[PDB]
Amino acid sequence: MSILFSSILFSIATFFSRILGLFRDVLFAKYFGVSYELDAYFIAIMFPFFLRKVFGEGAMSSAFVPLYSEKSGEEKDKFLSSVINGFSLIILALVILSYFFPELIINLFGAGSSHETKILAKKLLLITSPSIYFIFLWAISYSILNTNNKFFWPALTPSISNITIIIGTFLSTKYGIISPTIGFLIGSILMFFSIIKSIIKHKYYFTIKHFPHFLKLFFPTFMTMVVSQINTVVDMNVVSFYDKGSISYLQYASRFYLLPYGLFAVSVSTVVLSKISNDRKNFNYHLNDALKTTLFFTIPSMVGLIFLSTPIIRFFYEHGAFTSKDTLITSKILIAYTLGLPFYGIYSTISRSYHAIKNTKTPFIAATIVSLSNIILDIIFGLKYGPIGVALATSIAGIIGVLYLLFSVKTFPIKDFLKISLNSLIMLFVIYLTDFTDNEFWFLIQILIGILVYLIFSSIFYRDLIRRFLYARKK
Ligand SMILES: CCCCCCCC/C=C\CCCCCCCC(=O)OC[C@H](O)CO
Ligand code: NA
């Protein structure tokens, strides 16, 4: 498939998974409310949750796919075995350590939590810790499927874990908090089993010979692909340091922002890796293609999400004691983050294009520029300008990183940028004309209308592209 179609499929599958994640969270609130036991569950799943998130955004494939795709036969099998064996040894050590030093682990991941929460989290850790083994294997299978140009089904697999956790939550009336905890572990196992064929179609070897060279690429690419996780941790701690009272606003804005980020900032960047890795001589053609598609996703989503940020925050959060005044500040933080969406999309797409040809140094430089710029801007301006300033600093840091990366690749599809921007402005105009009611659900219709208007006028202004695609099909 084309980068556009594979990226749409990635985003659709991700959306479906995230819908079930929303239902999972709704049921948590229903079956546990605010209880220290749910807090213990969240501590216990923090690290595996983190691993699944970052691997789902390419932190494993960036190093695995370019080395795996360039090998064949016995070599390919021995590479895959080296990676599995190497990480299995590490993961075994980590799980054993967590079983012997649970207080240390929980003190690390559960700092600031109450005593009773930590005591329970130490028990639940015994159930959640082994999940990292199945998350790692899932990520390897995921990478292999991507190498074969398969993106929809891999991106749908988190649905499996969400369903198992939902089931465990339903069963918590009889069994309590251990039930969703076991659901989390079972979910990780079933996610891997659903795509186990990708691994076990290879022959297994008792080797680790390729593991050191793999790690040489894994370290910088992992750090490059987790930069936004770092920015989030930095932002949270700066806001917590400067203004305790604002941390919930930042958390709520960030929590929602994860949706458009996962749908639109890392879709093309996931697809472009295997596209270029399997056709490395056409790096520049595929990169420009991917940059166009990245903009095609991120510019209209930025524009529409900013216009609808207040109705979005209101719908999800304006209940109970969360007033319209809380909605206002939170929506402003969300806007500040959303301004960065196309820049983090471009950063991810260029970084992954470099990874495809095994250039880890240039994106690692960019990652260091982004993360350090964010830290510095957070500290300098966090006190005066509050959580809005902190969120805006994250977006500005992304701009700085993108400027470095664009100067490195020496290319940008300016004409398509202008066409996409115009179509996004036409979309915004129509959304504005439909903005005539305070009804709390209307923004959902407005999102649908926005998508349809954008696609309709995209088809008008990309008519030659469509004409060719249509005739190529008919031929
Ligand atoms: C389920 C939660 C815990 C799971 C923890 C992981 C489970 C697997 C355990 C150990 C892997 C050991 C793999 C053995 C592979 C070693 C091969 C080897 O050492 O080869 C050396 C060769 O001579 C030169 O390359
Ligand atoms: Na920031």
Coordinates of C-alpha atoms and ligand atoms in Angstrom, one line a residue:
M1 CA 0.0 0.0 0.0
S2 CA 0.8 3.7 -0.2
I3 CA 2.0 5.5 2.9
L4 CA -1.4 7.4 3.1
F5 CA -3.5 4.2 3.1
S6 CA -1.3 2.3 5.6
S7 CA -1.3 5.4 7.9
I8 CA -5.1 5.7 7.7
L9 CA -5.4 2.0 8.6
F10 CA -3.0 2.5 11.5
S11 CA -5.0 5.5 12.8
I12 CA -8.3 3.7 12.5
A13 CA -7.1 0.6 14.4
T14 CA -5.6 2.9 17.1
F15 CA -8.9 4.8 17.4
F16 CA -10.8 1.6 17.9
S17 CA -8.3 0.5 20.6
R18 CA -8.5 3.9 22.3
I19 CA -12.3 3.8 22.4
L20 CA -12.1 0.6 24.4
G21 CA -9.5 2.2 26.6
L22 CA -12.0 5.0 27.3
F23 CA -14.7 2.4 28.2
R24 CA -12.1 0.7 30.4
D25 CA -11.5 4.0 32.3
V26 CA -15.3 4.6 32.6
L27 CA -15.7 1.2 34.2
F28 CA -12.7 1.8 36.6
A29 CA -14.5 4.9 37.8
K30 CA -17.8 3.0 38.2
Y31 CA -16.4 -0.1 40.0
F32 CA -13.7 1.6 42.1
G33 CA -14.3 5.3 42.1
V34 CA -11.7 7.1 44.1
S35 CA -10.2 4.2 46.2
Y36 CA -6.6 3.6 47.3
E37 CA -6.9 0.1 45.7
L38 CA -7.2 1.5 42.1
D39 CA -4.3 3.8 42.9
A40 CA -2.3 0.7 43.8
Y41 CA -3.3 -1.0 40.5
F42 CA -2.0 2.1 38.6
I43 CA 1.3 2.0 40.4
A44 CA 1.6 -1.7 39.7
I45 CA 1.0 -1.4 35.9
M46 CA 3.0 1.8 35.4
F47 CA 6.2 0.3 33.9
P48 CA 4.5 -2.2 31.6
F49 CA 2.0 0.4 30.5
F50 CA 5.0 2.7 29.7
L51 CA 6.7 -0.1 27.7
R52 CA 3.6 -0.9 25.7
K53 CA 3.0 2.8 24.9
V54 CA 6.6 3.5 23.7
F55 CA 6.9 0.2 21.8
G56 CA 3.6 1.0 20.1
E57 CA 5.1 4.2 18.8
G58 CA 8.2 2.5 17.3
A59 CA 10.8 2.4 20.2
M60 CA 11.4 -1.3 19.3
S61 CA 11.0 -1.4 15.5
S62 CA 13.3 1.6 14.9
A63 CA 16.3 -0.6 15.7
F64 CA 14.8 -4.1 14.9
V65 CA 13.3 -3.5 11.5
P66 CA 16.4 -2.0 9.6
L67 CA 18.6 -4.8 10.9
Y68 CA 16.0 -7.6 10.4
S69 CA 14.9 -6.5 6.9
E70 CA 18.4 -6.3 5.4
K71 CA 19.2 -10.0 6.4
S72 CA 17.9 -13.2 4.9
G73 CA 17.6 -16.9 5.7
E74 CA 19.8 -18.2 8.5
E75 CA 21.2 -14.7 9.2
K76 CA 17.7 -13.3 9.7
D77 CA 16.7 -16.2 12.1
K78 CA 19.9 -15.8 14.1
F79 CA 19.4 -12.0 14.5
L80 CA 15.8 -12.5 15.7
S81 CA 17.0 -15.2 18.2
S82 CA 19.8 -12.9 19.4
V83 CA 17.3 -10.1 20.2
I84 CA 14.8 -12.4 21.9
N85 CA 17.5 -14.2 23.9
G86 CA 19.3 -11.0 24.9
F87 CA 16.1 -9.2 26.1
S88 CA 14.8 -12.4 27.7
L89 CA 17.9 -12.5 30.0
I90 CA 17.5 -8.9 30.9
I91 CA 13.7 -9.2 31.5
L92 CA 14.3 -12.3 33.7
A93 CA 16.7 -10.3 35.8
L94 CA 14.2 -7.5 36.1
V95 CA 11.3 -9.7 37.1
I96 CA 13.4 -11.6 39.6
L97 CA 14.6 -8.3 41.1
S98 CA 11.0 -7.0 41.3
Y99 CA 10.0 -10.1 43.3
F100 CA 12.9 -9.7 45.7
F101 CA 12.9 -5.9 46.1
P102 CA 9.2 -4.9 45.6
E103 CA 9.5 -2.1 48.2
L104 CA 12.3 -0.5 46.2
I105 CA 10.3 -0.8 43.0
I106 CA 7.1 0.6 44.5
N107 CA 9.1 3.4 46.3
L108 CA 10.5 4.3 42.8
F109 CA 7.2 4.2 40.8
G110 CA 4.8 5.1 43.7
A111 CA 6.6 8.0 45.3
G112 CA 4.2 10.2 47.2
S113 CA 1.5 7.5 47.4
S114 CA 0.0 6.6 50.8
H115 CA 1.4 3.8 52.9
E116 CA -1.7 1.5 52.4
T117 CA -1.5 2.1 48.6
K118 CA 2.2 1.1 48.5
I119 CA 1.6 -2.0 50.6
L120 CA -1.0 -3.2 48.2
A121 CA 1.0 -2.3 45.1
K122 CA 3.8 -4.5 46.3
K123 CA 1.4 -7.5 46.1
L124 CA -0.1 -6.6 42.7
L125 CA 3.5 -6.1 41.4
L126 CA 3.9 -9.9 41.5
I127 CA 1.1 -10.2 38.9
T128 CA 2.0 -7.2 36.7
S129 CA 5.8 -7.6 36.6
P130 CA 5.8 -10.7 34.3
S131 CA 3.7 -8.8 31.7
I132 CA 6.9 -7.0 30.5
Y133 CA 8.1 -10.3 29.0
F134 CA 4.9 -10.6 26.9
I135 CA 5.0 -6.9 26.0
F136 CA 8.5 -7.2 24.7
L137 CA 7.6 -10.3 22.6
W138 CA 4.5 -8.5 21.3
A139 CA 6.7 -5.6 20.2
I140 CA 9.0 -7.9 18.3
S141 CA 6.0 -9.6 16.5
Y142 CA 4.6 -6.1 15.9
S143 CA 7.9 -5.0 14.3
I144 CA 7.9 -8.1 12.0
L145 CA 4.4 -7.5 10.8
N146 CA 5.3 -3.9 10.0
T147 CA 8.3 -5.1 8.0
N148 CA 5.7 -6.9 5.9
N149 CA 3.6 -3.7 5.4
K150 CA 0.9 -4.8 8.0
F151 CA -0.3 -2.0 10.3
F152 CA -4.0 -2.3 10.9
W153 CA -4.0 -5.6 12.9
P154 CA -0.9 -4.8 15.0
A155 CA -2.4 -1.4 16.0
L156 CA -5.7 -3.1 16.9
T157 CA -4.1 -5.7 19.3
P158 CA -4.2 -3.4 22.4
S159 CA -8.0 -3.9 22.1
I160 CA -7.4 -7.4 23.4
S161 CA -5.9 -6.2 26.7
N162 CA -8.5 -3.5 27.2
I163 CA -11.2 -6.2 26.8
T164 CA -9.6 -8.5 29.3
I165 CA -9.2 -5.7 31.8
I166 CA -12.9 -4.6 31.3
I167 CA -13.9 -8.2 32.0
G168 CA -11.7 -8.3 35.1
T169 CA -13.3 -5.0 36.2
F170 CA -16.8 -6.5 35.8
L171 CA -15.7 -9.4 37.9
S172 CA -14.2 -7.2 40.6
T173 CA -17.5 -7.2 42.6
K174 CA -16.8 -10.8 43.5
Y175 CA -12.9 -10.7 43.5
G176 CA -11.8 -7.1 44.1
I177 CA -8.8 -5.3 42.8
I178 CA -6.8 -8.5 42.0
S179 CA -9.4 -9.1 39.2
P180 CA -8.4 -6.3 36.8
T181 CA -4.8 -6.8 37.8
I182 CA -5.0 -10.4 36.5
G183 CA -6.9 -9.1 33.6
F184 CA -3.9 -6.8 32.8
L185 CA -1.5 -9.8 32.9
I186 CA -3.8 -12.0 30.8
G187 CA -4.3 -9.2 28.4
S188 CA -0.5 -8.9 27.8
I189 CA -0.3 -12.7 27.2
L190 CA -3.2 -12.7 24.7
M191 CA -1.9 -9.7 22.8
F192 CA 1.3 -11.6 22.2
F193 CA -0.4 -14.9 21.3
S194 CA -2.6 -13.1 18.8
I195 CA 0.5 -12.3 16.7
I196 CA 2.8 -15.1 17.8
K197 CA 3.0 -16.6 14.3
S198 CA 5.3 -13.7 13.2
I199 CA 8.0 -14.9 15.6
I200 CA 7.6 -18.7 15.6
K201 CA 7.6 -18.9 11.8
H202 CA 11.4 -18.5 12.2
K203 CA 13.9 -21.2 13.3
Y204 CA 15.2 -20.6 16.8
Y205 CA 18.9 -20.5 17.7
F206 CA 20.7 -20.5 21.0
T207 CA 22.7 -17.3 20.2
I208 CA 23.2 -13.8 21.3
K209 CA 25.9 -12.9 18.8
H210 CA 23.9 -10.1 17.2
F211 CA 22.6 -8.6 20.4
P212 CA 25.5 -6.2 21.0
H213 CA 25.1 -4.6 17.6
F214 CA 21.4 -4.4 18.0
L215 CA 21.8 -2.6 21.4
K216 CA 24.1 0.0 19.6
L217 CA 21.1 1.0 17.6
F218 CA 18.4 0.4 20.3
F219 CA 19.8 2.8 22.8
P220 CA 19.7 6.0 20.7
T221 CA 16.5 5.1 18.8
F222 CA 14.6 4.3 22.0
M223 CA 15.7 7.6 23.5
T224 CA 14.6 9.4 20.3
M225 CA 11.2 7.8 20.2
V226 CA 10.5 8.4 24.0
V227 CA 11.2 12.1 24.0
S228 CA 7.6 13.0 24.4
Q229 CA 7.3 10.7 27.4
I230 CA 10.3 12.6 28.8
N231 CA 8.7 16.0 28.1
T232 CA 5.6 14.9 29.9
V233 CA 7.5 13.8 33.0
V234 CA 9.5 17.0 32.9
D235 CA 6.4 19.2 32.5
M236 CA 4.6 17.4 35.4
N237 CA 7.5 17.9 37.8
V238 CA 8.1 21.5 36.9
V239 CA 4.4 22.4 37.3
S240 CA 4.3 20.4 40.6
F241 CA 7.3 22.3 41.7
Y242 CA 6.1 25.8 40.8
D243 CA 2.4 25.5 41.4
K244 CA 0.9 22.5 43.1
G245 CA -2.6 23.8 42.5
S246 CA -2.3 23.5 38.7
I247 CA -1.1 19.9 38.3
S248 CA -4.6 18.5 37.7
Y249 CA -5.3 20.9 34.9
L250 CA -2.0 19.9 33.2
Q251 CA -2.8 16.2 33.8
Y252 CA -6.3 16.5 32.3
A253 CA -5.1 18.4 29.2
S254 CA -2.2 15.9 28.7
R255 CA -4.4 12.9 29.1
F256 CA -6.7 14.0 26.3
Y257 CA -3.8 15.2 24.1
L258 CA -2.5 11.6 24.1
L259 CA -5.4 10.7 21.7
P260 CA -4.6 13.0 18.8
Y261 CA -0.9 12.4 19.4
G262 CA -1.3 8.7 19.1
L263 CA -3.7 8.9 16.1
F264 CA -1.8 11.5 14.1
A265 CA 1.7 12.2 15.4
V266 CA 3.1 8.7 15.1
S267 CA 1.0 7.1 12.4
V268 CA 3.0 8.1 9.3
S269 CA 6.3 7.8 11.2
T270 CA 5.4 4.2 12.0
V271 CA 4.7 3.4 8.4
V272 CA 7.6 5.2 6.8
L273 CA 10.3 3.1 8.6
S274 CA 9.5 -0.1 6.7
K275 CA 8.8 1.8 3.5
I276 CA 12.3 3.2 3.4
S277 CA 14.0 0.2 5.0
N278 CA 12.8 -2.0 2.2
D279 CA 13.7 0.6 -0.5
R280 CA 16.6 2.6 0.9
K281 CA 17.9 4.1 -2.3
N282 CA 14.6 6.1 -2.5
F283 CA 15.0 7.7 1.0
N284 CA 14.3 11.2 -0.3
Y285 CA 11.3 10.3 -2.3
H286 CA 9.7 8.3 0.5
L287 CA 10.6 11.0 3.1
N288 CA 8.9 13.8 1.1
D289 CA 5.9 11.5 0.6
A290 CA 5.8 10.9 4.4
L291 CA 6.2 14.6 5.2
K292 CA 3.2 15.4 3.0
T293 CA 1.1 12.7 4.6
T294 CA 2.2 13.8 8.1
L295 CA 1.0 17.3 7.4
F296 CA -2.2 16.0 5.8
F297 CA -3.0 14.4 9.2
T298 CA -1.7 16.9 11.7
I299 CA -2.6 20.4 10.3
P300 CA -6.4 19.8 10.2
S301 CA -6.4 18.0 13.5
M302 CA -4.5 20.8 15.2
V303 CA -6.9 23.4 13.7
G304 CA -10.1 21.5 14.6
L305 CA -8.9 20.4 18.1
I306 CA -8.0 24.0 19.0
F307 CA -11.3 25.3 17.8
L308 CA -13.2 22.6 19.7
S309 CA -10.9 22.4 22.8
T310 CA -13.4 23.9 25.2
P311 CA -16.3 21.6 24.2
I312 CA -13.9 18.7 24.3
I313 CA -12.6 19.4 27.8
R314 CA -16.2 20.2 29.0
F315 CA -17.5 16.9 27.7
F316 CA -14.9 14.7 29.4
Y317 CA -14.2 16.7 32.6
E318 CA -16.8 19.4 33.4
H319 CA -18.7 17.3 36.0
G320 CA -19.0 17.3 39.8
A321 CA -16.7 20.0 41.2
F322 CA -14.9 20.7 37.9
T323 CA -16.4 24.0 36.9
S324 CA -16.4 26.0 33.6
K325 CA -13.5 28.0 35.1
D326 CA -11.5 24.8 35.4
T327 CA -12.5 23.9 31.8
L328 CA -11.2 27.3 30.7
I329 CA -7.7 26.9 32.0
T330 CA -7.5 23.3 31.0
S331 CA -8.6 24.0 27.4
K332 CA -5.9 26.7 27.2
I333 CA -3.2 24.2 28.2
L334 CA -4.6 21.7 25.7
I335 CA -4.4 24.4 22.9
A336 CA -0.7 25.1 23.9
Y337 CA 0.1 21.4 23.5
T338 CA -1.9 21.0 20.3
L339 CA 0.0 23.8 18.6
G340 CA 3.0 21.3 18.7
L341 CA 1.2 18.4 17.0
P342 CA 2.5 18.9 13.4
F343 CA 6.0 19.6 14.7
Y344 CA 6.1 16.4 16.8
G345 CA 4.6 14.6 13.7
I346 CA 7.4 15.9 11.5
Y347 CA 10.0 15.1 14.2
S348 CA 8.8 11.5 14.4
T349 CA 8.5 11.1 10.6
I350 CA 12.0 12.4 9.9
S351 CA 13.6 10.5 12.8
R352 CA 12.0 7.2 11.7
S353 CA 13.2 7.9 8.1
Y354 CA 16.7 8.2 9.3
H355 CA 16.3 5.1 11.5
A356 CA 15.3 3.2 8.3
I357 CA 18.8 3.8 6.9
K358 CA 20.4 3.2 10.3
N359 CA 21.2 6.8 11.0
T360 CA 20.6 7.0 14.7
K361 CA 22.9 9.9 15.5
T362 CA 21.0 12.7 13.7
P363 CA 17.6 11.9 15.4
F364 CA 19.4 11.4 18.7
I365 CA 20.9 14.9 18.4
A366 CA 17.4 16.2 17.6
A367 CA 16.0 14.3 20.7
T368 CA 18.6 15.9 22.9
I369 CA 17.8 19.4 21.5
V370 CA 14.1 18.9 22.1
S371 CA 14.3 17.5 25.6
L372 CA 16.9 19.9 26.9
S373 CA 15.2 22.9 25.3
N374 CA 12.0 21.9 27.0
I375 CA 13.7 21.5 30.4
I376 CA 15.3 24.9 30.1
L377 CA 12.2 26.7 28.8
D378 CA 10.1 25.0 31.5
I379 CA 12.4 26.2 34.3
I380 CA 12.9 29.7 32.9
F381 CA 9.2 30.5 32.2
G382 CA 7.3 27.9 34.2
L383 CA 6.8 30.1 37.3
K384 CA 5.7 33.3 35.5
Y385 CA 3.5 31.7 32.8
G386 CA 2.2 28.6 34.7
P387 CA 1.0 25.4 33.1
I388 CA 0.1 27.1 29.8
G389 CA 3.6 28.3 29.5
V390 CA 5.0 24.9 30.3
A391 CA 2.8 23.3 27.7
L392 CA 3.7 25.9 25.2
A393 CA 7.4 25.3 25.9
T394 CA 6.9 21.7 25.0
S395 CA 5.5 22.8 21.6
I396 CA 8.3 25.3 21.1
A397 CA 10.9 22.7 21.9
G398 CA 9.4 20.5 19.2
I399 CA 9.7 23.4 16.7
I400 CA 13.4 23.8 17.5
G401 CA 14.0 20.1 17.0
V402 CA 12.1 20.1 13.7
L403 CA 14.2 23.1 12.5
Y404 CA 17.3 21.1 13.2
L405 CA 15.9 18.0 11.4
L406 CA 14.7 19.9 8.4
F407 CA 18.1 21.6 7.9
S408 CA 19.6 18.1 8.1
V409 CA 17.3 16.5 5.4
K410 CA 17.3 19.7 3.4
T411 CA 13.8 19.3 2.1
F412 CA 10.1 20.2 2.8
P413 CA 7.0 19.8 0.6
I414 CA 6.1 23.5 0.7
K415 CA 3.4 23.3 -2.1
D416 CA 1.5 20.5 -0.3
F417 CA 1.9 22.4 3.0
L418 CA 0.0 25.3 1.4
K419 CA -2.7 23.1 -0.1
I420 CA -3.2 21.2 3.2
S421 CA -3.4 24.5 5.1
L422 CA -6.0 25.9 2.7
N423 CA -8.1 22.8 3.0
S424 CA -7.8 23.0 6.8
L425 CA -9.0 26.7 6.6
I426 CA -12.0 25.7 4.5
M427 CA -12.7 23.0 7.1
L428 CA -12.4 25.5 9.9
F429 CA -14.8 27.9 8.2
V430 CA -17.5 25.2 7.9
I431 CA -17.0 24.1 11.5
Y432 CA -17.3 27.7 12.6
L433 CA -20.6 28.0 10.7
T434 CA -22.0 25.0 12.6
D435 CA -20.9 26.4 16.0
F436 CA -24.4 27.5 17.0
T437 CA -25.3 25.5 20.1
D438 CA -24.1 24.9 23.6
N439 CA -25.3 21.2 23.5
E440 CA -22.6 19.1 25.1
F441 CA -22.6 16.5 22.3
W442 CA -22.7 18.8 19.3
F443 CA -18.9 18.9 19.0
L444 CA -18.9 15.2 18.1
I445 CA -21.1 16.0 15.0
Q446 CA -18.7 19.0 14.4
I447 CA -15.7 16.6 14.3
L448 CA -17.5 14.4 11.8
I449 CA -18.4 17.4 9.7
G450 CA -14.8 18.7 9.9
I451 CA -13.4 15.4 8.7
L452 CA -15.8 15.2 5.8
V453 CA -15.3 18.8 4.7
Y454 CA -11.6 18.3 4.9
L455 CA -11.6 15.1 2.8
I456 CA -14.1 16.5 0.3
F457 CA -11.9 19.6 -0.5
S458 CA -8.7 17.5 -0.3
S459 CA -10.2 15.5 -3.1
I460 CA -11.0 18.6 -5.1
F461 CA -7.5 20.1 -4.7
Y462 CA -5.7 16.7 -5.2
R463 CA -7.8 15.8 -8.2
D464 CA -4.8 14.8 -10.4
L465 CA -3.5 12.5 -7.6
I466 CA -6.9 10.9 -7.4
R467 CA -7.3 10.7 -11.2
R468 CA -4.0 8.8 -11.5
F469 CA -4.9 6.5 -8.5
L470 CA -8.3 5.7 -10.1
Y471 CA -6.9 4.9 -13.5
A472 CA -4.0 2.9 -12.0
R473 CA -6.7 0.8 -10.3
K474 CA -8.7 0.3 -13.5
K475 CA -5.7 -0.6 -15.6
Ligands
LIG1 C1 7.5 -15.0 32.5 C2 8.3 -13.9 33.3 C3 9.8 -14.2 33.3 C4 10.3 -14.5 31.9 C5 11.8 -14.3 31.8 C6 12.4 -14.7 30.5 C7 12.0 -16.2 30.3 C8 13.2 -16.9 29.6 C9 14.3 -17.1 30.7 C10 15.6 -17.0 30.3 C11 16.0 -16.8 28.9 C12 17.4 -17.5 28.6 C13 17.5 -17.6 27.1 C14 18.7 -18.6 26.8 C15 19.4 -18.1 25.5 C16 20.9 -18.1 25.8 C17 21.6 -18.5 24.5 C18 23.1 -18.2 24.6 O1 23.5 -17.8 25.7 O2 23.9 -18.4 23.5 C19 25.3 -18.1 23.8 C20 26.1 -18.5 22.5 O3 26.9 -19.6 22.9 C21 26.9 -17.3 22.0 O4 26.0 -16.6 21.2
NA2 NA 7.2 22.0 28.4

